Structures are given as structure tokens and as C-alpha cells.
Design an enzyme around this catalytic site. Structure first.
Site, PDB file in Angstrom:
ATOM      1  N   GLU A   1      37.525  39.773  49.079  1.00  0.00           N
ATOM      2  CA  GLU A   1      36.941  39.333  47.814  1.00  0.00           C
ATOM      3  C   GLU A   1      35.453  39.034  47.948  1.00  0.00           C
ATOM      4  O   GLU A   1      34.661  39.394  47.068  1.00  0.00           O
ATOM      5  CB  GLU A   1      37.666  38.090  47.287  1.00  0.00           C
ATOM      6  CG  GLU A   1      39.071  38.335  46.761  1.00  0.00           C
ATOM      7  CD  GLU A   1      39.108  39.114  45.447  1.00  0.00           C
ATOM      8  OE1 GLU A   1      38.029  39.423  44.891  1.00  0.00           O
ATOM      9  OE2 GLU A   1      40.225  39.434  44.991  1.00  0.00           O
TER      10      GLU A   1
ATOM     11  N   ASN B   1      32.332  41.073  35.588  1.00  0.00           N
ATOM     12  CA  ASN B   1      33.415  41.936  35.139  1.00  0.00           C
ATOM     13  C   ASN B   1      32.998  42.697  33.888  1.00  0.00           C
ATOM     14  O   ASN B   1      32.035  42.340  33.205  1.00  0.00           O
ATOM     15  CB  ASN B   1      34.669  41.118  34.854  1.00  0.00           C
ATOM     16  CG  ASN B   1      35.116  40.319  36.050  1.00  0.00           C
ATOM     17  OD1 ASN B   1      35.162  40.838  37.163  1.00  0.00           O
ATOM     18  ND2 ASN B   1      35.431  39.046  35.834  1.00  0.00           N
TER      19      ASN B   1
ATOM     20  N   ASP C   1      34.295  42.805  30.979  1.00  0.00           N
ATOM     21  CA  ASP C   1      34.384  42.048  29.734  1.00  0.00           C
ATOM     22  C   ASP C   1      33.310  40.967  29.603  1.00  0.00           C
ATOM     23  O   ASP C   1      33.373  40.168  28.662  1.00  0.00           O
ATOM     24  CB  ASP C   1      35.775  41.421  29.591  1.00  0.00           C
ATOM     25  CG  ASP C   1      36.012  40.272  30.569  1.00  0.00           C
ATOM     26  OD1 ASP C   1      35.237  40.123  31.539  1.00  0.00           O
ATOM     27  OD2 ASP C   1      36.976  39.504  30.360  1.00  0.00           O
TER      28      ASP C   1
ATOM     29  N   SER D   1      32.804  38.451  31.745  1.00  0.00           N
ATOM     30  CA  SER D   1      33.087  37.312  32.603  1.00  0.00           C
ATOM     31  C   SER D   1      32.535  37.568  34.009  1.00  0.00           C
ATOM     32  O   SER D   1      32.128  38.678  34.350  1.00  0.00           O
ATOM     33  CB  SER D   1      34.590  37.035  32.652  1.00  0.00           C
ATOM     34  OG  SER D   1      35.312  38.118  33.220  1.00  0.00           O
TER      35      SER D   1
ATOM     36  N   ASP E   1      32.957  36.509  38.375  1.00  0.00           N
ATOM     37  CA  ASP E   1      33.780  35.991  39.465  1.00  0.00           C
ATOM     38  C   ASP E   1      32.892  35.262  40.463  1.00  0.00           C
ATOM     39  O   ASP E   1      31.798  35.734  40.782  1.00  0.00           O
ATOM     40  CB  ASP E   1      34.515  37.117  40.179  1.00  0.00           C
ATOM     41  CG  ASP E   1      35.302  37.970  39.238  1.00  0.00           C
ATOM     42  OD1 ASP E   1      35.994  37.404  38.359  1.00  0.00           O
ATOM     43  OD2 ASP E   1      35.209  39.207  39.369  1.00  0.00           O
TER      44      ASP E   1
ATOM     45  N   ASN F   1      37.523  33.683  38.365  1.00  0.00           N
ATOM     46  CA  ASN F   1      37.021  34.306  37.138  1.00  0.00           C
ATOM     47  C   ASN F   1      36.706  33.260  36.068  1.00  0.00           C
ATOM     48  O   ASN F   1      37.500  32.342  35.823  1.00  0.00           O
ATOM     49  CB  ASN F   1      38.080  35.285  36.606  1.00  0.00           C
ATOM     50  CG  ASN F   1      37.518  36.349  35.697  1.00  0.00           C
ATOM     51  OD1 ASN F   1      36.480  36.177  35.075  1.00  0.00           O
ATOM     52  ND2 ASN F   1      38.229  37.467  35.599  1.00  0.00           N
TER      53      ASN F   1
ATOM     54  N   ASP G   1      50.529  30.159  38.808  1.00  0.00           N
ATOM     55  CA  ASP G   1      50.618  30.482  37.388  1.00  0.00           C
ATOM     56  C   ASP G   1      51.641  31.566  37.072  1.00  0.00           C
ATOM     57  O   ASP G   1      51.642  32.083  35.950  1.00  0.00           O
ATOM     58  CB  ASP G   1      49.241  30.888  36.835  1.00  0.00           C
ATOM     59  CG  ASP G   1      48.840  32.326  37.177  1.00  0.00           C
ATOM     60  OD1 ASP G   1      49.569  33.039  37.904  1.00  0.00           O
ATOM     61  OD2 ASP G   1      47.755  32.752  36.715  1.00  0.00           O
TER      62      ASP G   1
END
Ligand code: NA
EC number: 3.2.1.17
Length: 129
Positions: free
Chosen positions: A35, A46, A48, A50, A52, A59, A101
Site C-alpha cells: 500500500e 482516487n 472519485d 477521495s 488515501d 480512504n 466492517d
């Protein structure tokens, strides 16, 4: 901060990630490697809009507030910049919520594509843990 491999493993173990939700320590070190290349200051945008953040590339669409992701959530209740610290406490505590989650470590695209189904224990071989 750029962590060493065993240095990061020891710090993740101290913060309770070893076998958290059944994921052995090697999974987390492998995930961090691909990562962020072990770099707490890593960021990536990203498609969209957003972003990281940090060693585990958390995110801003769901987990932190960076002030430039309108309409998003802040489920770890932190500014995203906190995730870039040399102190990995905030990243680990937020990671614990993500992995809980329902999707496990499949939340991390690099883990699914580069760690899942491999010999992840290799990533802690040689370390004094
Ligand atoms: Na957010």
C-alpha cells in the site's frame, strides 16, 4: 517516516494487530508494504476525488476528514493528516474498525491482489517478535 520491515512488525504487534480478526501479523506487514512501501507520508488520489492516506492508505471517502471530500464520512473521527504521523497509533486504530466492517482485509485492494493466498509469514521472517 519510512519504517523498516521488522520495526513495523514490532510496532503493529505492540498495537494489537497480530491475529486481529484472525489476520496474522504477516498479512498486515504485506499490506503496508504494497500500500505505502512502509512510508507513513504516502498519499494517493482516487478517481472519485477521495484520497488515501498513510502506511495503510486509508480512504477519505469513509474514514477520515481531509476537507476536500464533500459528501463523505469520517468514521474514524480523525483528520486524514493524523494518518501521516510517524506515530502509527491512529492508522492502526482506524484499521481495526475497517477490518471489522464485514469485508475483512479485502478492503485493501493491494492485500487482495498481492498478499492474499501467498506465504504472508515470509514478511516477518527474521524479526525478533
Ligand atoms: Na471523509
Amino acid at each position: 517516516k519510512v519504517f523498516g520491515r521488522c520495526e513495523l512488525a514490532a510496532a503493529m504487534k505492540r498495537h494489537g494487530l497480530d491475529n486481529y480478526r484472525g489476520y496474522s501479523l504477516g498479512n498486515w506487514v504485506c499490506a503496508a508494504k504494497f500500500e505505502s512501501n512502509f512510508n507513513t507520508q504516502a498519499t494517493n488520489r482516487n478517481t472519485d476525488g477521495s484520497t488515501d492516506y498513510g502506511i495503510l492508505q486509508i480512504n477519505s471517502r469513509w474514514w477520515c476528514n481531509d476537507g476536500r471530500t464533500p459528501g463523505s464520512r469520517n468514521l474514524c473521527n480523525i483528520p486524514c493528516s493524523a494518518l501521516l504521523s510517524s506515530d502509527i497509533t491512529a492508522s492502526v486504530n482506524c484499521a481495526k474498525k475497517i477490518v471489522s466492517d464485514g469485508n475483512g482485509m479485502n478492503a485493501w485492494v493491494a492485500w487482495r491482489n498481492r498478499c492474499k493466498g501467498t506465504d504472508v509469514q515470509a514478511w516477518i521472517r527474521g524479526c525478533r517478535l
